[PDB]
Symmetry: D2
Subunit: 121 residues, 4 copies
């Protein structure tokens, strides 16, 4: 019963939309971030992911990848959709932001990590 | 320099294998993952993964991310990294991952996420 | 702008409390942490912590890190973050942590590290 | 019997020393990194940490903080000391590098994560 489909916003002011989830748990979406680590102008970017359907849990885990359209980086988020007594949903996620580096010797510094909480609308 | 491509069969440094299919013009790909190690005693099942490669500036060593939707637990893992040509000329994926466990209630969310690394090379 | 200082009693967003003592001229400090939550079935006990604040350029919002040496589990947590003055003028510590569980075999080292955030405010 | 005391090197060519561990599990050390995220010249920097002494485990966990002397950042490492059949030790660790940001709205991008394996030098 906690569904990922909808329009969500996070603590930083970014918004995301997620469409219908198919029977395979696959979904697509859009992400408009309010903040960036680049100096490039932000552009709405696509996202793709899946919800885990094992045991058809009411509060499933999920993951998705945001394919940034204004930088060479990629972010992944994973988390769980929690739904209260009243039907109010929260997604509690963690993410990794992968920057592009030119030299393999600099790989060690390429991955930032953090949390995000999404609520609806 | 060679272009590093994600399509192919890979193995990681713990002996898990994944196969990634063709990457489409939107940077999307599908594959399967067969893990050698596990955080559950349930029998391991090949599981699908889906992700994208970043094609901005058409870099020869692109970043990417994907989600593995495990078929034998309620967890999900995400990986992100970059496809490099290594110093010896081989393709290698340098990745980090978050493994999200399912918790029964929200007050246990703090303990639900593991993190680590993996390096993949082509099989 | 106030200088954000780590000395004091703090509480987090899960009800855990910590107390940090004076910071010496080398940036070192000691404290105690009383966690509201645990991943063990042991009785929680107050545990020591030790860490440092970075004093380079004597920033008024310095970074810092510390290790909590749990006295009721075989695990270790490390925290690192920055002491900020918030938009409302209050001190706030914004931190990230890694909780390292003990495993028995080196093959299981990949599942030993959980990650998360904590924000602390002064009590 | 796996002991943190010694000189170690990691997989990127950084070295560290750790001195005697006291009965409270406390130790001090030094760290000379081979790599940096700053453009400042590298300087050997002190570290302080603890090993967990509960049940006096033969392969203890531990954590420590490196207080960089050439940047405003801090890195913390945590991991476990493993020791094999003939006494060969390896420290398997993960780390968080906290950079300094000027404004609290940029906190989200301040923390990088990675692994490090140390062996005896
Ligand atoms: C709220 C939150 O944590 N995030 C959010 O909504 N936007 C930022 C990042 C934006 C990356 C854009 C591409 C780039 O700068 O390379 S993904 C994690 C973080
Ligand atoms: C090599 C490596 O680090 N990993 C790998 O290849 N398999 C494991 C995890 C498998 C999770 C299976 C689902 C579950 O147990 O819930 S994903 C990160 C780790
Ligand atoms: C609030 C927050 O995120 N944390 C907090 O205040 N307590 C928990 C963990 C406590 C570990 C106790 C020892 C053990 O169970 O192994 S450290 C991160 C987390
Ligand atoms: C091997 C490994 O991963 N690390 C290592 O030995 N040095 C780098 C970083 C050095 C930070 C220096 C201070 C700064 O640049 O601000 S700590 C993690 C990483
Ligand atoms: C989020 O949606 C709200 C209004 O619905 C808008 O005010 C805000 O600018 C959006 N955020 C971004 C980053 O577009
Ligand atoms: C990885 O593929 C190799 C070579 O085919 C195979 O022998 C091995 O069993 C595979 N690993 C897993 C976990 O299936
Ligand atoms: C935090 O300190 C407050 C105020 O003294 C107290 O009510 C609460 O029990 C403490 N939390 C824990 C985990 O001890
Ligand atoms: C590490 O110690 C080795 C052996 O002395 C030395 O070759 C190397 O330069 C040291 N690394 C650094 C970053 O000092």
């Amino acid at each position: 019963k906690c569904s990922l489909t909808g329009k969500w916003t996070n603590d930083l002011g970014s918004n995301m939309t997620i469409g219908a989830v198919n029977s395979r748990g696959e979904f697509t979406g859009t992400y408009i971030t309010a903040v960036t680590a680049t100096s490039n102008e932000i552009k709405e970017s696509p996202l793709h992911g899946t919800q885990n359907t094992i045991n058809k849990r009411t509060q499933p885990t999920f993951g998705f990848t945001v394919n940034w359209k204004f930088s060479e980086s990629t972010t992944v988020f994973t988390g769980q959709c929690f739904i209260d007594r009243n039907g109010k949903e929260v997604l509690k996620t963690m993410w990794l932001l992968r920057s592009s580096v030119n030299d393999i010797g600099d790989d060690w510094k390429a991955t930032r990590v953090g949390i995000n909480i999404f609520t609806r609308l």
